[PDB]
Amino acid sequence: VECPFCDEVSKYEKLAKIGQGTFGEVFKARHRKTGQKVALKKVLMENEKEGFPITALREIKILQLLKHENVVNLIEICRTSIYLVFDFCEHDLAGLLSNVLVKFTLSEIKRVMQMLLNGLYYIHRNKILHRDMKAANVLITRDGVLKLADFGLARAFSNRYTNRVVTLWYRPPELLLGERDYGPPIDLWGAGCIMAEMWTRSPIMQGNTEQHQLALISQLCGSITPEVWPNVDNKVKDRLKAYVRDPYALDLIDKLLVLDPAQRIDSDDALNHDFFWSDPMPSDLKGML
Amino acid sequence: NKRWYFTREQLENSPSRRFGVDPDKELSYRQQAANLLQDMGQRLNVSQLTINTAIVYMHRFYMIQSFTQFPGNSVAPAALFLAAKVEEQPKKLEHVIKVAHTCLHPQESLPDTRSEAYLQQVQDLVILESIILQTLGFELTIDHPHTHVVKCTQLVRASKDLAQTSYFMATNSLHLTTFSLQYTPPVVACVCIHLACKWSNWEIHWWEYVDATVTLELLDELTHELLQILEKTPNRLKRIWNWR
Numbered sequence A: 001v002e003c004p005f006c007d008e009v010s011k012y013e014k015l016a017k018i019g020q021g022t023f024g025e026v027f028k029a030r031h032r033k034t035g036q037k038v039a040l041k042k043v044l045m046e047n048e049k050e051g052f053p054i055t056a057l058r059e060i061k062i063l064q065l066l067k068h069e070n071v072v073n074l075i076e077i078c079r080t081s082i083y084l085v086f087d088f089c090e091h092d093l094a095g096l097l098s099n100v101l102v103k104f105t106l107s108e109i110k111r112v113m114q115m116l117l118n119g120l121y122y123i124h125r126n127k128i129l130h131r132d133m134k135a136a137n138v139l140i141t142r143d144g145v146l147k148l149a150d151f152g153l154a155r156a157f158s159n160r161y162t163n164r165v166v167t168l169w170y171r172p173p174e175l176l177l178g179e180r181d182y183g184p185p186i187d188l189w190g191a192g193c194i195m196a197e198m199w200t201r202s203p204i205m206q207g208n209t210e211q212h213q214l215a216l217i218s219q220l221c222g223s224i225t226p227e228v229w230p231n232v233d234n235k236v237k238d239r240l241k242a243y244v245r246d247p248y249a250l251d252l253i254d255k256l257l258v259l260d261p262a263q264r265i266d267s268d269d270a271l272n273h274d275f276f277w278s279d280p281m282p283s284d285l286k287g288m289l
Numbered sequence B: 001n002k003r004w005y006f007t008r009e010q011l012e013n014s015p016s017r018r019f020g021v022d023p024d025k026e027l028s029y030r031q032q033a034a035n036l037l038q039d040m041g042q043r044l045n046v047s048q049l050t051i052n053t054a055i056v057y058m059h060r061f062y063m064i065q066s067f068t069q070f071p072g073n074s075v076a077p078a079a080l081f082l083a084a085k086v087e088e089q090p091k092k093l094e095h096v097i098k099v100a101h102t103c104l105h106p107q108e109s110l111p112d113t114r115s116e117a118y119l120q121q122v123q124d125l126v127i128l129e130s131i132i133l134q135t136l137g138f139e140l141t142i143d144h145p146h147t148h149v150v151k152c153t154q155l156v157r158a159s160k161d162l163a164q165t166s167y168f169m170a171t172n173s174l175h176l177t178t179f180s181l182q183y184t185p186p187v188v189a190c191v192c193i194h195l196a197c198k199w200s201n202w203e204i205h206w207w208e209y210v211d212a213t214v215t216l217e218l219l220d221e222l223t224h225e226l227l228q229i230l231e232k233t234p235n236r237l238k239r240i241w242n243w244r
């Protein structure tokens, strides 16, 4: 049987599980001819009763669409199982943030957030919701370029969308309140949480059940109120004051972590925020790495 | 970008041609698969869009594979099963097998879904779906002319009538021709509008705002090819014939 357009994954040489700890079976591997490093993501088939996983189909459909400096790069799809092959990225925001030897300057934090917000602006602009914003899904290349990754829960938008979305700690009020008519603001809330995480070095809100998250959110953003959040019913700066200190950084974080999604800042306005346009200006990632 | 567009000479040396299937025969094989997809799709209550996607999958697949090694009657269900997932109108595996079975065997009776022979026809479909993905190199995003038909027929202010005939021409171009293998969707859409205009004696150049490559020389060549197969297709033209 001929197959001009699907290469055997044997073209790559497996180096290291990196890892199952990251939502699944992803390997670092090496092109056998050029040495080019890649990431191999196996398409898992346990309890796949309906042929090729509709989920693999969306992510493949989506990644094929999204071509941008701040979105992970799908190179090709390989057979033998089936593998998604990505350009390899050495670091991930979660690893870097949990490593005491790693240190970000204010100048560098600006740049990390700038790349992230730009990736989001782009994917949203393409009618895609990532739906799984979290530090461990933000990659940074050996050269200090940030890439959004793990589009396995991502989906196109334009409503009765699924409510089982976004890791608990990064999940926005809308969803925890059972909202099914949500949009790009959900990714931005996660963007808020990751930003704050750039200083606190740990996820600001670590709930245990959906309600424990909601209580926590309230102990930070004020409480969910029809005055604060029109139609909802159907201390941000003080707690971060310690770690952050910089006025501008704190303010954006306040506008990302806004309770009402329609009053929550979007990717375009955040990129515009004075935080990226005052000193120290955003700087490249060299010494962080 | 020209991966899945072929010249007329490439269409002559198709995989099927290599195993001795005549040109004419190969079209039949293609037209018959499009019918099976259209029939199954209607029964499964999927959209025309989903049916169309599956037809394009099928057309492309047979630029790589041979009818002498993969029969339309095997490929159609798999293509459709796949296209329904891709287009977000997933139909269940058993359901698609059940409907395919009734289309291909109106008088037969579904096997016991516990039998080894049925467990096997399920397994065959999954295998074939997998081969389609690899044959198409996992490129599943199809652009269809219908998007663009709507576009022209508004931007030339056609009666609902004219617009409906254009959609009809567009749908039929997929079943009856290999245009989707030769011309981009915007050109095919121009072809369908042109013939629809000719068929209704409407006169509106309009196409230059739709595709820079398009020439009247080409439009007339293509509407003629299309009108002919339409004339060869029993009862098809009756559907758009003004009987008053």
Ligand SMILES: Nc1n[nH]c(N)c1/N=N/c1ccc(O)cc1
Residues within 6 Å of the ligand: A018, A019, A022, A026, A038, A039, A041, A059, A072, A086, A087, A088, A089, A090, A092, A139, A149, A150, A151, A152
């Ligand atoms: N951990 C990693 N290093 N390099 C990668 N591409 C990588 N992961 N990439 C992914 C992982 C999951 C996914 O859905 C898309 C891209």
